[PDB]
């Protein structure tokens, strides 16, 4: 019988797959113990939702990180800070960045996604990196003045 396993099963396969197993094995084990479900014409449909949804869901999430890819790449981030001769007065972390970035223009970004752990304590310009999408990063130009 055709079934839909919603659980990493050794011999069978990973979640969401469709494999036909022996009747009993599914009628007295899988289905009963809540591992897979009788893949009827009904569930096959609701499965297409699982696919199409999650699909265009991250395909539109990567399509939105496509707008930040175009604008965050062709723009420099000038940060008006104080500094002695080489190193900075205050100190710029990932907040002083996503903050003055949301202000100087209005772009909404998280200091969490922004790939930087080092609390910038030197003056000059650098090339940061932001991670909106796992496979579509964006090098955010810096300019700590």
């Amino acid at each position: 019988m055709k079934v839909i396993l919603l659980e990493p099963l050794e011999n069978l396969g990973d979640v969401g797959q469709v494999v036909d197993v022996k009747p009993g094995y599914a009628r007295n084990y899988l289905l009963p113990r809540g591992l897979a479900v009788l893949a009827t014409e009904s569930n096959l449909k609701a499965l297409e939702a699982r696919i199409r949804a999650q699909a265009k869901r991250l395909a539109e999430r990567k399509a939105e990180a496509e707008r930040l890819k175009e604008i965050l790449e062709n723009l420099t981030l000038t940060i008006p800070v104080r500094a002695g001769e080489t190193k900075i007065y205050g100190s710029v972390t990932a907040k002083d960045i996503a903050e003055a970035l949301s202000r100087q223009h209005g772009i909404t970004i998280d200091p969490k996604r922004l790939a930087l752990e080092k609390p910038i304590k030197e003056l000059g310009e650098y090339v940061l990196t932001y991670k909106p999408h796992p496979e579509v990063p964006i090098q955010l130009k810096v300019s700590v003045v």
Binding site: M1, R27, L31, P32, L38, T40, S42, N43
Partner: protein, 88 residues
Amino acid sequence: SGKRPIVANSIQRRGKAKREGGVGKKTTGISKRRQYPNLQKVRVRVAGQEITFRVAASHIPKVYELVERAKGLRLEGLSPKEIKKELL
């Protein structure tokens, strides 16, 4: 019996023993026999409680298939027998 989605009252028919050649001639010895329908028990969860089906071998899936249509149903509160009826 046979009273389930199957509905297969075991009907009797003839069971005749024949001696012959087949391509030489043929004769017989007739009797009456009761042909029962292969019928097994099917226990299944179904919402709260459990539930048994004295169903046939043919219409086994029909049960679990029905259990599927049952998810689109609203039931609860001590429903041993009443589940079956309200179960189509």
